[PDB]
Amino acid sequence: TFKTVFAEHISDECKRRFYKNWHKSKKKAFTKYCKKWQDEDGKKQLEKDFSSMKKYCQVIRVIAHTQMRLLPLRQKKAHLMEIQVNGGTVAEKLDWARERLEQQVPVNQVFGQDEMIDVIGVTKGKGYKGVTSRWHTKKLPRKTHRGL
């Protein structure tokens, strides 16, 4: 990881992701970072970071999150994901990313119908179960002492 540049308008769902106890937290994240984005003299030390990003990096990933306000869930924390842009050259990938900072990405934009797209997730936890349920081995008959 060379350097990470975060946007200015960071949502409260992302702040709930960064904190653990949102009740006990004083909501103090990214105050100086947004002050650096707001200051004009800090932009001259910030636009050089993208010029170094154009020169040295090849893999650029885009951290995005979900809107928990549209969901019927109770979690209210937004999950962050790095999304590797597999487009053209690093210069226009950076231009595309800075053009679409602080913006929504619909699924109908990138993904389409009749497409073969794999799903990655975490299985249903069944708990601390035994051998004939986990490994699906053959059971022992009724006559067996000390375990079937």
Binding site: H79, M81, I83, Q84, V85, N86, G87, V110, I120, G121
Partner: protein
């Protein structure tokens, strides 16, 4: 020895470290490769099983 009824083995050696994952959001191990011929797009989105 000479087990006399050879059976296919239960389970898989490739999925053997059956530890709980430290993360619950399933991360991406590998993204597809890139090229300047293809236009600029994203690869991975989030979702919730309804």
């Amino acid at each position: 020895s000479h087990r006399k009824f050879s059976a296919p083995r239960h389970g898989s050696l490739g999925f053997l470290p059956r530890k709980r994952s430290s993360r619950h959001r399933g991360k991406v191990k590998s993204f597809p490769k890139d090229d300047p011929s293809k236009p600029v797009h994203l690869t991975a989105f989030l979702g919730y099983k309804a």
